[PDB]
Amino acid sequence: AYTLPDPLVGADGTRVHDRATWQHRRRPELLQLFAREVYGRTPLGRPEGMVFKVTTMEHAALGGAATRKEVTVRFGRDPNAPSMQLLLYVPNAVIARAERAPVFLGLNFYGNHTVAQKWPVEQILARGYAVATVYCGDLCPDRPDGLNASVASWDQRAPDAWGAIGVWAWGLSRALDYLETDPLVDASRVAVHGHARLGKAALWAGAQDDRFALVISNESGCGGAALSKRIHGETVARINTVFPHWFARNFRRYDDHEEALPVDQHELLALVAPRPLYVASAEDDDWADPRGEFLAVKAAEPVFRLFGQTGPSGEDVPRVNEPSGGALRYHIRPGPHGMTAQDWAFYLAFADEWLK
Ligand SMILES: O=C(O)[C@H]1O[C@@H](O)[C@H](O)[C@@H](O)[C@H]1O
Numbered sequence: 001a002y003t004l005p006d007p008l009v010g011a012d013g014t015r016v017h018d019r020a021t022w023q024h025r026r027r028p029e030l031l032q033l034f035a036r037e038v039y040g041r042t043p044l045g046r047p048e049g050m051v052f053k054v055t056t057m058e059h060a061a062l063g064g065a066a067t068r069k070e071v072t073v074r075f076g077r078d079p080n081a082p083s084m085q086l087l088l089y090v091p092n093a094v095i096a097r098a099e100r101a102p103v104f105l106g107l108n109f110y111g112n113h114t115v116a117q118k119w120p121v122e123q124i125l126a127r128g129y130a131v132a133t134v135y136c137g138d139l140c141p142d143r144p145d146g147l148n149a150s151v152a153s154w155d156q157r158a159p160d161a162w163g164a165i166g167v168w169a170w171g172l173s174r175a176l177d178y179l180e181t182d183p184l185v186d187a188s189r190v191a192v193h194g195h196a197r198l199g200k201a202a203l204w205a206g207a208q209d210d211r212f213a214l215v216i217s218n219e220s221g222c223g224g225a226a227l228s229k230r231i232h233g234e235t236v237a238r239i240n241t242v243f244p245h246w247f248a249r250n251f252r253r254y255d256d257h258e259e260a261l262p263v264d265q266h267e268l269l270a271l272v273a274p275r276p277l278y279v280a281s282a283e284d285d286d287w288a289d290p291r292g293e294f295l296a297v298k299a300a301e302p303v304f305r306l307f308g309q310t311g312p313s314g315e316d317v318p319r320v321n322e323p324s325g326g327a328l329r330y331h332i333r334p335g336p337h338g339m340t341a342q343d344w345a346f347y348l349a350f351a352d353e354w355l356k
């Protein structure tokens, strides 16, 4: 089935007519719904005893274009406590103006020094932006028994307990804790971004953690930006069966039963409002369900409009390589699933508008 629940009708049926009601009544309702039925509850906020050790600082990386820092973010005072490694490139030209750089923060899938994977780090830097990354497997190994060797392990797990997407997302927020202590970056101007499974975590981190200034979802698909109730491409039963550690056990109640869902992903997107949000698809990426990613944006737009922000105009998918929307923005690009220089060019212009 497929009737979408209204972001702007509360659980008790009252109509959300103002931003205060949205901020302090409706948002907590949706956050707790997504936590309980989909991603699982985030248990730890900031742990006590987090320690940041800057292990490497190189002031003339990439030809003097960038400063590169390597940072262990340790999650306890003990020196052999669990940790993650954050890689940061800062543009030198911005440091030379005595300004903290705005930052693109995203998880990587193959390791910090694979960005197999490559992002246009040099272009991002050339455009005046810092780049930070953490390998997702320092937080939760992407495998079905992966939570036992993960930050969440330090007869089973509870049905509303978080999986890998929630642990990855919590990792992004801890990366932001670090960025707040780093005088070369403006932690109030952080674009949190992700591709595919890591875009699911980027969305979930941006909705829970409203410190993030900008949120970018690149082809995050099922249980990211795509409407589950559309039953197109990847389905809930497919994703929980192949990746049973990603979501909460409770998400499996919705296996082949998306009609029963009490929310859909347009409401995840609405939790970014009023902060700028970018959802993007690939034209041949039927698995992620591009129309469903676009329609989730459109069904989220009323919440942005409550704050006077606008989304893609038109009620169907805009032409390829034509981004559309104000603070709430979409593009679809030609070709297959991935993250490309085309996507990044559109993201950088969006950031130029909202972070510089
Ligand atoms: O790109 C990938 O490997 C993944 O992308 C995700 O968004 C999708 O849910 C996975 O099934 C897999 O296709």
Ligand SMILES: [Mg+2]
Pocket (backbone or CB within 6 Å): 221, 222, 226, 227, 228, 230, 231, 232, 233, 234, 235, 287, 288, 289, 292
């Ligand atoms: Mg789908």
